[PDB]
Ligand binder design. Sequence first.
Ligand code: OXL
Ligand code: OXL
Ligand code: OXL
Ligand code: OXL
Ligand code: MG
Ligand code: MG
Ligand code: MG
Ligand code: MG
Lengths: 519, 519, 422, 437
Amino acid sequence: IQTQQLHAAMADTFLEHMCRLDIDSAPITARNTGIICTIGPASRSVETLKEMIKSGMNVARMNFSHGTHEYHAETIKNVRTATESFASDPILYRPVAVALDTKGPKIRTGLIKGSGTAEVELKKGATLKITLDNAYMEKCDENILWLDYKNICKVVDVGSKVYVDDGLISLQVKQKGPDFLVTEVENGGFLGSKKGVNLPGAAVDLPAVSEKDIQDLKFGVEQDVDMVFASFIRKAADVHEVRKILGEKGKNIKIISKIENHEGVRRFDEILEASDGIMVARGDLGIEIPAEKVFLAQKMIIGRCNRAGKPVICATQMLESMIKKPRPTRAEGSDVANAVLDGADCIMLSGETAKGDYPLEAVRMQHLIAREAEAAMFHRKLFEELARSSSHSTDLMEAMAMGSVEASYKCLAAALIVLTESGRSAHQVARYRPRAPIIAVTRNHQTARQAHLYRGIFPVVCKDPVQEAWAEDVDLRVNLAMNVGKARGFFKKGDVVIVLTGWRPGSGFTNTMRVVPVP
Amino acid sequence: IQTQQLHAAMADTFLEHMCRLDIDSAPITARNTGIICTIGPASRSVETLKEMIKSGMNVARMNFSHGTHEYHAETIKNVRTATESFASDPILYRPVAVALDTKGPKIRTGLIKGSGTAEVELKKGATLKITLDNAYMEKCDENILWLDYKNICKVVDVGSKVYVDDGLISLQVKQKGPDFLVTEVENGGFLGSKKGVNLPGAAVDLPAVSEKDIQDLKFGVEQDVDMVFASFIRKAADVHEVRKILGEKGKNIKIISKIENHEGVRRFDEILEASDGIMVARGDLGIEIPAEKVFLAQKMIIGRCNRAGKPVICATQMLESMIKKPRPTRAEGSDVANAVLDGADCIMLSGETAKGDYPLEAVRMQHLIAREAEAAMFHRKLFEELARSSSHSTDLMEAMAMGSVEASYKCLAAALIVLTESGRSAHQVARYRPRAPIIAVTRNHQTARQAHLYRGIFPVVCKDPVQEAWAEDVDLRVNLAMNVGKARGFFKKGDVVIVLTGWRPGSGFTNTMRVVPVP
Amino acid sequence: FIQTQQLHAAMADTFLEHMCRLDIDSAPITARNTGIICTIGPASRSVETLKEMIKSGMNVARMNFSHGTHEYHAETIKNVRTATESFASDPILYRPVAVALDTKGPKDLPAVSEKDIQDLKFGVEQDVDMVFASFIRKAADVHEVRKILGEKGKNIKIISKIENHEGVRRFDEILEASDGIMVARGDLGIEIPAEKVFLAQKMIIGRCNRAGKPVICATQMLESMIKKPRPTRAEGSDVANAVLDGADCIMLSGETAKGDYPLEAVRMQHLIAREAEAAMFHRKLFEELARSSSHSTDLMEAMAMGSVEASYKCLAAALIVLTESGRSAHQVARYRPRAPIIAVTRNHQTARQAHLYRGIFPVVCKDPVQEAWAEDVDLRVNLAMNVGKARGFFKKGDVVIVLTGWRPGSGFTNTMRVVPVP
Amino acid sequence: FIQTQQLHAAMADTFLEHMCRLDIDSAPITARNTGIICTIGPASRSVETLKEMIKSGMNVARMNFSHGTHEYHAETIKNVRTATESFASDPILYRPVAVALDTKGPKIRTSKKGVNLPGAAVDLPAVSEKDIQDLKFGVEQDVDMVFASFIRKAADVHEVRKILGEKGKNIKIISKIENHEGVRRFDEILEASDGIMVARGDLGIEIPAEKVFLAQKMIIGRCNRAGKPVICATQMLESMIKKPRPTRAEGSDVANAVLDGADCIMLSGETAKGDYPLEAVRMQHLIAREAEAAMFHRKLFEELARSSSHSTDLMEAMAMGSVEASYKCLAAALIVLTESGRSAHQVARYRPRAPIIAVTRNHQTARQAHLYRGIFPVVCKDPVQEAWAEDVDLRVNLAMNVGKARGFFKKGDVVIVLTGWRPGSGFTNTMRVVPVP
Ligand SMILES: O=C([O-])C(=O)[O-]
Ligand SMILES: O=C([O-])C(=O)[O-]
Ligand SMILES: O=C([O-])C(=O)[O-]
Ligand SMILES: O=C([O-])C(=O)[O-]
Ligand SMILES: [Mg+2]
Ligand SMILES: [Mg+2]
Ligand SMILES: [Mg+2]
Ligand SMILES: [Mg+2]
């Protein structure tokens, strides 16, 4: 039985491809999908972070929805300590990226009239007036409810729906006022204090970057974060504002736009054009749109991201049950596998690593499933279709990337080696989805850290000084890649690899491709 | 905005098809994937079952792992009471099938020494003797463990793994003895009394049908069940053995083989050939094989069943969290949607409807997700690949089915109407996956109930007597389907349907196809 | 042993493997789907020669009005009709033959000259089945020909001849206006660089296939056979590749009009057509035609696609189509089954014009309309059974697709059946 | 506003839409990939006419030993070589010309026309005594290839191979398929042969004429599948023996033979004895260029890759990667440094639309490369530089200057360059996207 689902790889049709999937066809060692871990109480100690790295974590995510600057600064310090605890061995060292996830725009209710812990009950068909009057800020009850969104009246019409407490309660706008809305309770429940509010189908005019977000983005520039996950992006202008706040000092920080509501989906193309990558933020997205539609948006977005060559992250509740249990449900294994088959560059753990009981098991399981689904991709068709989608472009590096990936298919190369400094050459190789891993050797540490955003890039930091003879400097980096690959078990002596390098020191991309045996 | 993802339907490639999935494209009313609900304490009252039927239940599953014959007979009687409560209106009556799911062969440990309610701790790296000596049957502990599987020594080698308590505990056979096993605790835990044992990769020679199973199968025959879900099917002989047990009285009862371990997967083709259908029983399957591999087996199995035209069920933990919560996780919505896209004819609920707090919510969510994913199928490609896969067959009924489905694609027919008595004509239409629903009108009540196993067959019982004039009998049955379709909102006057009928009373299949406007 | 009709190649996954599987020992079927159009002139206008030309496979007779008086072509047409009707006693074996008038056209010139107007009116008076309109340059020329044919010739199919650069560049509007197209390669090869003709040919056939409108490939197909009894290798190749391109009909000009070997030329076109028809890649072609027409949801198109699909699946020996305007049969032929289409009609002009469509074998039912709709439908369906058995298309126990109207007022064949041959 | 070289049709999703987009106003490129093979005879064997034949595009000269003495054909070959070398002073513009020997094979003669017996068990030998003498004469004359008439089985090919023996071991054997048995036993014949000719003259008599195209498309397909050269021959422009312009069926035939995938097309009487040999060569050159652009390269590449997917050969990987890159960036050429020819052959099998400039120091490699679609061979006569990189750069720049001189590309255009990394590299393991200097 061939490894890596290669029998299924040879199928003519997608049906026969599916039919040939073999549970006894062992995957390869290398795992191409990036794993993004939300760091929290369960995972922010240095020792646990070392174990997260060993288990497969590639990006550490700090959710600034909560936590002080001091707290997240400590977390980032602990991440970097754990990461550098491995730095003595350049051949085993794994770059770990650092991501800042902004709090973004939020709509919150007031305090329920009473002592605290108090609740009111909303019965279907009842009347509830929403009021912006700060006089009712702490006197919410069954008849009057205050929320912090001063402009809500301008963005809602009669009959539009208002969700409260993460969609648990739904309201329909019956009458509209200047500083109030009169609504009928469509779906009822018990309402507590300071709950989340969502406005499905509305063009929310809250600022793209709030005052807290500006402070947090400047903090992230100060802490040398590799990338920002920007919340509730509804339009390209929101990305532009985030970019302006990051400004010239943070020009190289990768901006990942989070798609979280209907407008972000409807305007997704302009957002994608303006972004460096995308996160499918399925939790809030499933509150804003019918949950049964989320997969449509997920697949659309991953497809379009794959088309543009831009990183896409699938996030939220992928292994939810592992917050409390050491093993995932069958639905969760299926969700991770199908996100990989969809084409997600990275998959994410939220509560599973922030606060749950089994963060390391969660990371390890995402790693195992990811390797299995990577082999099960139908690469020949995927490659043909990606090439068809990008055919209006005649970019020279895409030509080399496509030629190199084709060569890697034809001779079943064990890896592609890419010498890169901005990372773009490796990015363009990853875009055309080879099955073999991409060992990207770079002297730019931030390039290495950001590379985790691209499917299949295993970044290696070259710390050697520049060799005077360009050819010998190239051979140095290629041999670094050979040794890393041998140590990680991706290939051995006598295997075949594709090597992408620059012809001369002034070559602006890897314009040179070779089939080389491993020494 | 085109409905039913028809814009994505027109794409040239799978990538572009995915890129065109649009959350604002509304699905049709008809829902094709069958929903199989496990009935238990949370759902067996007559009134709740009426709600189950209205919310979308097509098959009632009785899990005979537990429950007395009296309990399940009462449950089945309540299912039939609820079902017949709609029978006064033939146009609104919905056939509801009744399925018996056998307990099957099981390996169980002994009682923990003392009360029996005690537990002992199995420490990783510790040693554990498995024993067949009935003296330790009730004196199980941390050092010695008794199993009721007398032949285990015959089917296990040194280095084999033994899982205990639903995979929570893992043992590796270090030394093999005459009536015992010396094992190392690879994965530890607290071992209670009388827990399940699994033997990954082992050819378990327990009987296909246990002593309990024979009694339960005869009980199901007396109860006039439409179908049996036969547990732990490992090979064709097991399906035959079950078929023999069902005998002459149960010759028309459909046998659905549950693939639950490695051997059933490895020997899947012969099992498929011998069965009427297949269940991807992901729970036990994920205990027997690495959970990260279950999706492979799922897609392979669904593909192969789709290839053969035989019903396939996806089962277990699809909406697991809904046992305790009123809405599913995003991983669960993804799981259901991808099961439908895989091509599963039916999706299943177990604890979610048997015992959970939100059974009706689970049914409703499966129904909504199924409709959205059905629209998102890539019908043109699926049809081409199914046809290519079956191209060595020149069967006349397949020819009629493919022509009818092709015509239904071309003119966007609102439905296909198929007059059938054995069901085979409707089965062959459903096999070639039209997007429009299949209204199968039959005088055979059992055919109507069993048709629920096939994607898209909406079965309708004709209770009228046979008309002397064949043409008038045909028109009677066709108008019944038209009236059901209008009442269910599947089409209205002026829409177009495909109608498949027999030319004369002696036609052995629907050899006549028409494109008809809805009156 | 060896599958017939290039069916082994039919099962191929790629076009390359389809080529690699072409087997000179895989026998074609008896039926020949590509229409044969013969220019009649001195070598072929006698009643006896025309009888043998029908028997050899001529389906359409073309009168080239570049030269000749009305009296001369009138007599040619009379002899055509005499030879044709000599077979009319046997309705099972009678073969309808269409009569086509090819206008002289421009020889800054107007689309339709004064001579051309008189000739077109003559064609109306002569009851021609179709007009081949020379040097069509734009849709307006087609509209002129249509107005000149007027109400009396409103049923005369207008086949525009694409003969220069402008006609190619403006081909889409011409095709929209036309009932069909001829790739008139003689003049086209002079008006545009000869080495580009194949591009034009392949483009035009493709677009006509996309539309379901008849396309004729014409001129010098078997040129050397004017003076020689056997074709050159390039000429056999040219006929075969014109069939593979998708031509509904292939044409003979001097080869039958004035050459020494008219019958041999017709027979050679018949043989090559039959072999090339089997060598088509039907699965991909059907998929690509369906893809191209998917914005249409027409009901008869759906019936045609479903019936062609069913005929592929069960390898039906034929599709039997009951039709009066021909449209039902035209829609079936458009989706290119490999099996012959036996179109039974009571409209004689319909039967004659059906030759413009690949695979339509027209059969004129002469019995009177039966009182019961079901019995009249069986009458025409059994007419087709008897024709197919007599012509060697099928025998008892074979499977045929049968397309009929359900009830008397059906506006198309809305009923499809898979039927055993009696 | 109108793409060249049928690039709009190149973007189609289906074969049908690819046909519908074929555009007579889309200009083809200057380079012509299909090799042109000319039979030399009384109408064309003079040194001056042969110069004009080279300039019109003749790539291979064919000596038909059905008639003529050794001395006569020796003189024809001598004149070919004189005409060819008259251009050798300029290595940038020198065009290698291959010499081919076409054996007489079995014949039946009666005034003394040939006789054909379809379906007869002709007892004639595979290789006659005259055939043996002519093959040895070809070895003595340093012919680049042999067209072996009437091969019926692999054993016939093996006989010709043995007769050529060790002294002629590099002479390419092109089996001529011209009767039913050769078609039926084609797979073993292809395996044993270096290439194939579809000898449609004899084939159209030995099998029913209406079946010839079936054989032609089958054979070209299988030869394309194997990467072995296939020639389409006989009566492609027959009417041009006596007329200055071809018939429509003849233009169609040449164009469809290129579309089928034939590496070469041939002229026999049209150049051997006809009144318009130069015109026949020029007509094939023009039609080839138009049909070459009209190929459906994307589907063709997918299907060739699919049929060869069981191979993981490294040079195949380089060729497929280089051709894929040449499609993506619309490169004007692929430059291939080769000595045996194998690397360039492997590129040619995967059918780029851009021309393949094969730079070699092996003169016979250069002459034989004309059997492969798109290989424009260039003879490097410079001495070997001491530094490998400098020698590679020297040959690559020779190719640059050739492409600039021939109008294939200009400064600032993009080319794919296939070279060996080190002198002992056994194939072109190095690919670059390079700007033209
Ligand atoms: O905001 C998020 O991260 C989400 O909802 O997934
Ligand atoms: O039996 C089942 O349903 C299972 O294990 O999934
Ligand atoms: O008129 C014609 O038939 C032509 O020019 O080919
Ligand atoms: O020998 C040949 O070239 C032929 O037969 O065509
Ligand atoms: Mg959010
Ligand atoms: Mg189970
Ligand atoms: Mg003309
Ligand atoms: Mg010969």
